[PDB]
Design a protein around this ligand. Structure first.
Ligand SMILES: Nc1ncnc2c1ncn2[C@@H]1O[C@H](COP(=O)(O)OP(=O)(O)O)[C@@H](O)[C@H]1O
Ligand SMILES: [Ca+2]
Ligand SMILES: [Mg+2]
Ligand code: NA
Length: 315
């Protein structure tokens, strides 16, 4: 499931060839083009690396820390230079400058799936089949080639582009950065598995739940917890809870599911197997890769790029 297409292999080759010409990244070599998005951890700008002429996405994490800590962080992120896959956002490098850690990556012109969702209303099942394939393959790559687990799968961490690529980003690789960030920074816990919210099971299975939950949100066009009444559903396909309550709901109530009738039974089964509360019963990456929904989607000739460009107005 990690074999590379001819077009894929060629795209990875080109990326590295370009990266090789870059050299050490420095604050002054960047020119701001526009803001891509934010978060309570840092901001992301579309930038131009003046010397190379390469356009990148630059994430800035404001951190007031000693020269020792930051230098360790920069060291830890170097691991990102080895994560090369068609399902992982490209990495250029990381550096520190005047109170901010910079993480430079390949720019994905389609933005994140949370942004795409906002614009589409809801994402079609066939499109979600391609998204599912990408995410599974991305997690498989991380686990297999780097023994790494994502830890933060969610719609804003899945990026897409006009080329039809779907890639994962923001997977924790620097423990030090996490700590220092844990301060005034804390990302949503709304996509975390019940076991992780219970301090219990902590593995790749947890990322599978997050993916399953993200898929339901995108299919229905709303964070699926708590479930939509019969009233909302009828207006959606014709056919506010506090964060702490949300987390309790997730741990104590049955997992969400897709509405019946409007989605194929294979898609419903796939999300169901991703969302089983008990991590042991929950399907694993190997099983998902051969699930009927994945086999079917993999065989479908879906023009994701075409759909994407028309949906967000690129085109
Ligand atoms: N390589 C990238 N290309 C294009 N947009 C990106 C890229 N990396 C991040 N973004 C955008 O920046 C937004 C903010 O990213 P981030 O700081 O990690 O916060 P969050 O994931 O909580 O949204 C993302 O939601 C996405 O829209
Ligand atoms: Ca400077
Ligand atoms: Mg992110
Ligand atoms: Na600067």
């Amino acid at each position: 499931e990690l074999e590379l297409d001819e077009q894929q292999r060629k795209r990875l080759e080109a990326f590295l060839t370009q990266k090789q010409k870059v050299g050490e990244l420095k604050d002054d070599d960047f020119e701001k083009i526009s803001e891509l998005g934010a978060g309570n951890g840092g901001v992301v700008f579309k930038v131009s690396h003046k010397p190379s002429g390469l356009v990148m996405a630059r994430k800035l994490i404001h951190l007031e820390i000693k020269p020792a800590i930051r230098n360790q962080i920069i060291r830890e992120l170097q691991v990102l230079h080895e994560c090369n896959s068609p399902y992982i956002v490209g990495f250029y490098g990381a550096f520190y400058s005047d109170g901010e850690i910079s993480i430079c990556m390949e720019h994905m012109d389609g933005g994140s799936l949370d942004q795409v969702l906002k614009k589409a209303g809801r994402i079609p099942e066939q499109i979600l089949g391609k998204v599912s394939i990408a995410v599974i393959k991305g997690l498989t790559y991380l686990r297999e080639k780097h023994k790494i687990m994502h830890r933060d799968v969610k719609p804003s961490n899945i990026l897409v582009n006009s080329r039809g690529e779907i890639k994962l980003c923001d997977f924790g690789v620097s423990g030090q950065l996490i700590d220092s960030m844990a301060n005034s920074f804390v990302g949503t816990r709304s996509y975390m598995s019940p076991e992780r919210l219970q301090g219990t099971h902590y593995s790749v299975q947890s990322d599978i739940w997050s993916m399953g939950l993200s898929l339901v949100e995108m299919a229905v066009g709303r964070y699926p917890i708590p479930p939509p009444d019969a009233k909302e559903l009828e207006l959606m396909f014709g056919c506010p809870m506090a964060i702490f309550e949300l987390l309790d709901y997730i741990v104590n109530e049955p997992p969400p599911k897709l509405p019946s009738g409007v989605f194929s039974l294979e898609f419903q089964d796939f999300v169901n197997k991703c969302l089983i509360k008990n991590p042991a019963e929950r399907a694993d990456l190997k099983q998902l890769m051969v699930h009927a929904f994945i086999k079917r989607s993999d065989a479908e000739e879906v023009d994701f790029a075409g759909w994407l460009c028309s949906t967000i107005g690129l085109n």
